[PDB]
Design a protein around this ligand. Sequence first.
Ligand SMILES: CN(C)CCCN1c2ccccc2CCc2ccccc21
Ligand SMILES: CN(C)CCCN1c2ccccc2CCc2ccccc21
Ligand SMILES: CCCCCCCCO[C@@H]1O[C@H](CO)[C@@H](O)[C@H](O)[C@H]1O
Ligand SMILES: CCCCCCCCO[C@@H]1O[C@H](CO)[C@@H](O)[C@H](O)[C@H]1O
Ligand SMILES: CCCCCCCCO[C@@H]1O[C@H](CO)[C@@H](O)[C@H](O)[C@H]1O
Ligand SMILES: CCCCCCCCO[C@@H]1O[C@H](CO)[C@@H](O)[C@H](O)[C@H]1O
Ligand SMILES: CCCCCCCCO[C@@H]1O[C@H](CO)[C@@H](O)[C@H](O)[C@H]1O
Ligand SMILES: CC(C)C[C@H](N)C(=O)O
Ligand code: NA
Ligand code: NA
Length: 511
Amino acid sequence: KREHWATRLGLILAMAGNAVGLGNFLRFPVQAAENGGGAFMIPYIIAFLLVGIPLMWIEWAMGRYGGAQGHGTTPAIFYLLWRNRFAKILGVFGLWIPLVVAIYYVYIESWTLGFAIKFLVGLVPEPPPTDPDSILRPFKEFLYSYIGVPKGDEPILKPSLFAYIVFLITMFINVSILIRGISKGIERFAKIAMPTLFILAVFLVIRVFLLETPNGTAADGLNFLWTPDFEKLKDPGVWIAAVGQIFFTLSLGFGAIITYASYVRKDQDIVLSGLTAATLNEKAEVILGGSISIPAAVAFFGVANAVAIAKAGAFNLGFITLPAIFSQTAGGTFLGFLWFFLLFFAGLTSSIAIMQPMIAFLEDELKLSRKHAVLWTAAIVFFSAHLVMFLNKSLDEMDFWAGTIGVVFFGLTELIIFFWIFGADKAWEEINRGGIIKVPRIYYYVMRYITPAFLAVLLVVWAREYIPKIMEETHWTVWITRFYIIGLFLFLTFLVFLAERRRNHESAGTL
Ligand SMILES: CN(C)CCCN1c2ccccc2CCc2ccccc21
Ligand SMILES: CN(C)CCCN1c2ccccc2CCc2ccccc21
Ligand SMILES: CCCCCCCCO[C@@H]1O[C@H](CO)[C@@H](O)[C@H](O)[C@H]1O
Ligand SMILES: CCCCCCCCO[C@@H]1O[C@H](CO)[C@@H](O)[C@H](O)[C@H]1O
Ligand SMILES: CCCCCCCCO[C@@H]1O[C@H](CO)[C@@H](O)[C@H](O)[C@H]1O
Ligand SMILES: CCCCCCCCO[C@@H]1O[C@H](CO)[C@@H](O)[C@H](O)[C@H]1O
Ligand SMILES: CCCCCCCCO[C@@H]1O[C@H](CO)[C@@H](O)[C@H](O)[C@H]1O
Ligand SMILES: CC(C)C[C@H](N)C(=O)O
Ligand code: NA
Ligand code: NA
């Protein structure tokens, strides 16, 4: 019938690995530092309670429900919940979003492997022996030469040969896990990766906590991040950033939680399991991810400079600043290795999660073998990634449409289909069925009224005071990426159409 997670621990760690990734260690620090630190945290915590938790339960429920009938992806699941052809089309986003995100996420993940390798072997810049630019410049040049940032006017990137080869290796590693399946692949790997990730992260926090310079200490960083600023609570931008981060960090709206949950046995609890996966992610994000790069940057440069660093380049903090700071300490190159190794495992456990939806669709709906499903998915991602590797800003365009606005739109869509169309009481029943614990009574009202209203308002503000600038103030090359990803949606819709026909073909054979 269908693969199933072998153990409860395996399920929890696989789901935790799905969630805990580059978003916790790279994205969170930038969003927080960029939005006033503590001022960002209030909306963040509220978004977690009003959006993160409820949507997590909903996605687990939708996945388990679909899995019981042999379906793990939204084109089919949405249809099961709402037998309307439009359900299948909306469901395509559950394949498109994770695919598009994988197309750039796996490449960023590959940079962490490449950096881990170079730092391990000591092929790193030799900063000069205390002028900040003289210290940071060598590391900025290191990153820029790796990914091939434009030195001229052309919006073209020229990745180093090493970077390209490392992306290939990274794709191979993802495949090596996925090709073994759910219990012998993803689950087995999670039991090894998560413990390693936790240990590495705790160690790094401890080392960072020992940092002190004439400019400050790690403590100043924590105070910056954990001191409330009730005067920003009225800024939509902060709310948009906070909600966006919650979706991204919890893997919500990517169809990934849903697919993983489709392997949970029909009787199995999802209330406690889902809540645990969610809380584990938040601890890894605010306690671990929040305690590494920000405190380190603030300790060495002070708050004002740390904040300016993050705003200047989203990848500055994790790929340039932290390694530069580490280089000023004994054994700093090895500490850099540990940081990038941590990022790699965090990324790896998440990228396999966003490639599994396409794999599940090809297996469940087009009946391909796991081997063929995994290889074709890898081929599509590998090929498509060339756009992200060679066209400047393609990555940002994909991250916006699929990884930012896309997931919020899809989150609202799945909630409406499950809690409104399918039926609020049928949905509530499905969520709580088999639960080790019941979902708190108040959450019924949050899921049915609060969450959808919250997201609806957010999306309207996004499309009215932000999306116009992205459509009018960007370089013309953004249309190359938009064109390509719209094509991917077209192709995936064609596959759903073919799945429909095979099912009809197959039914007229069941007759
Ligand atoms: C703004 N351009 C340069 C980066 C956008 C993508 N990006 C983002 C997005 C917002 C804030 C920070 C970061 C950096 C880390 C990260 C990690 C994984 C996937 C995407 C991201
Ligand atoms: C100690 N041994 C069992 C772990 C190393 C193997 N391991 C790993 C670990 C890191 C990178 C790649 C891979 C290969 C594929 C893979 C698949 C399932 C379980 C573990 C792994
Ligand atoms: C199958 C799809 C192929 C698309 C064309 C890919 C061309 C990649 O080309 C390779 O890029 C590397 C990184 O920039 C360079 O180091 C190599 O020398 C170059 O041959
Ligand atoms: C993980 C092992 C990766 C090995 C590939 C390293 C690519 C780094 O650099 C490349 O190495 C090639 C052969 O040494 C040279 O011919 C290229 O000119 C050089 O740029
Ligand atoms: C949209 C994605 C298009 C990918 C096409 C990539 C074509 C690669 O082009 C190659 O890149 C190498 C490294 O940058 C150069 O050294 C080669 O001279 C160049 O021909
Ligand atoms: C979005 C895709 C960006 C691809 C960047 C490709 C850079 C390739 O390199 C270019 O290839 C041309 C034709 O092969 C040559 O005529 C140019 O001299 C060469 O620089
Ligand atoms: C905005 C979302 C807030 C969620 C916090 C929920 C805290 C749980 O609250 C508890 O829920 C139980 C079950 O319904 C009740 O029996 C308890 O009386 C109630 O205090
Ligand atoms: C797209 C998701 C799998 C990303 C993951 N939740 C992270 O925080 O990195
Ligand atoms: Na996360
Ligand atoms: Na992960």
